[PDB]
Amino acid sequence: LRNGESDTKRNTQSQNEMNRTGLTKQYLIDNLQKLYSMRDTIFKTYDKECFLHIW
Amino acid sequence: MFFKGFMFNDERIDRYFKESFTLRFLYREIGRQTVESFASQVLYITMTHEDYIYRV
16 A cells, blocks of 8 residues: 655746837938928028018 | 038038039129128028038
């Protein structure tokens, strides 16, 4: 006559960490056309208000 | 005289841009009374659109 007994305890602890980055640049001609007058638009507001307008 | 000490970093860009400018208006007359006012206007227009010139 043979008897027995068993017992187990498995305990796992884990940690993860993921750092994903990216950078996508799209070149379109439509952006160059809109680029043209960004700087010039600054001084249209200066000229309209601050300066004289008759020769 | 015209672009008063304004130079693009790239050599070829600078040469081609200024050659185009001086070729287009070789015989045209300056708009303003003097060459200083015309030079100031040209320099301002160049500085304002320097990024578009660089890209193009």
